Amino acid sequence: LTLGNTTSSVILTNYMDTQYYGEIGIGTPPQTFKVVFDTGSSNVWVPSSKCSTACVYHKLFDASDSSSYKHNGTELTLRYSTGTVSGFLSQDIITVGGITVTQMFGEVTEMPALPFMLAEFDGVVGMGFIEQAIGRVTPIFDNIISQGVLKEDVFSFYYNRDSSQSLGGQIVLGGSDPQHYEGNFHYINLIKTGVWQIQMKGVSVGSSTLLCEDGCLALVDTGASYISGSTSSIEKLMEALGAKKRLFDYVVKCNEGPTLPDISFHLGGKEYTLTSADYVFQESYSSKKLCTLAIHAMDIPPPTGPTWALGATFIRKFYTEFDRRNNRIGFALAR
Ligand SMILES: O=C(NCC1c2ccccc2Oc2ccccc21)[C@H]1CCCNC1
Ligand SMILES: *[C@@H]1O[C@H](CO)[C@@H](O)[C@H](O)[C@H]1NC(C)=O
């Protein structure tokens, strides 16, 4: 008897406004892992006890301590923006919030030091669609929908601003937390099912629509730390903001930061505005200091890209709901 009224929540940890991670349990008894819940990918993976370099810094899964483990052994390679991971498939019981699902995940044996020694999380829970899943492995949310236990076939994200004994964030499975948003949701449908990507009708700097006038794509990526666009777009945008290209990021003089113009994204006939307080890492106010912007360039290869990606920078401002039943994304202002 699976009566659909569940709304299981996961408390997230905010690390530097770049990494938001919660706790999952794998096995019988459960082995806990710090995971990033990523709408940009669809595979679940944790480091393996069978791991031979970043592995030393993370919690490892030992199949030999799980009574519910079922072998598979299929080799698997998962490629992200900063680096690639490698391992094999295994099956066990995964606990997320108060939900228990039999999930096929990847035990990772090859995990490079760069970028994984910078990661504060052990693994990744992909919140994308089977269409994006490596080796056509059923994603965890698809398996939760199959249980027929949720209030609604939706999940929502809340990413807070770094503070202190405060909530870093929160994923709700089955609904949305009204304590974390103001007013009502505005929905935008997905271009196609299979990707958490919507149409964008322009990017503005101040009150002038500078970019994406003839339309472009926007990927709603909980796994991305920043807002990203193509090199072309980010060059135009940063020139408008008067930001200079440093080696890995764009900076402005720290004094110039509070006077930077609003950046607006046109999504579903509504403008979603980020003020300077939302995209500048205001670490100092000095003229002698350089301050980083929470916006970078990233070229996403086809079929997904070229696209913009609305990461933690966007999500922190706008509470996000991902609707599987209706294939649409909802934004309400975060609280
Ligand atoms: O690579 C991504 N995000 C970066 C973020 C990350 C998210 C998911 C998987 C691996 C991963 O690597 C690191 C390592 C250190 C710090 C942050 C990250 C994107 C790639 C496309 C799908 N979403 C996540
Ligand atoms: C591993 O899992 C796949 C499903 O992705 C299945 O088709 C395959 O037969 C399994 N292989 C083994 C060795 O159990």
UniProtKB/Swiss-Prot annotation:
Q: What is its main location?
A: secreted
Q: What class of enzyme is it?
A: hydrolase
According to its UniProt record, which reaction does this protein catalyse?
A: Cleavage of Leu-|-Xaa bond in angiotensinogen to generate angiotensin I
Q: Which GO terms describe its cellular component?
A: apical part of cell; extracellular region; extracellular space; plasma membrane
Q: How is its activity regulated?
A: Interaction with ATP6AP2 results in a 5-fold increased efficiency in angiotensinogen processing.
Q: Which domain of life is it from?
A: Eukaryota
Intracellular or extracellular location(s): Secreted; Membrane
Disulfide topology? C51-C55, C212-C216, C254-C291
Q: Sorted alphabetically, which keywords does the UniProt record give? A: Aspartyl protease, Cleavage on pair of basic residues, Disease variant, Disulfide bond, Glycoprotein, Hydrolase, Membrane, Protease, Secreted, Signal, Zymogen
Q: Where is the Peptidase A1 domain?
A: 20-332
Catalytic residues, per the record, are D38, D221
Report the protein's function: Renin is a highly specific endopeptidase, whose only known function is to generate angiotensin I from angiotensinogen in the plasma, initiating a cascade of reactions that produce an elevation of blood pressure and increased sodium retention by the kidney.
Cite the record's note on assembly: Interacts with ATP6AP2.
Which medical condition is this protein associated with?
Renal tubular dysgenesis: Autosomal recessive severe disorder of renal tubular development characterized by persistent fetal anuria and perinatal death, probably due to pulmonary hypoplasia from early-onset oligohydramnios (the Potter phenotype).
Q: Which family does it belong to?
A: Belongs to the peptidase A1 family.
> What name goes with this protein?
Renin
Q: Report the source organism.
A: Homo sapiens
Tell me the organism's taxonomic lineage.
Answer: Eukaryota, Metazoa, Chordata, Craniata, Vertebrata
What gene name does this entry carry? REN
Q: Which residues of the full protein are shown?
A: 67 to 406 of 406
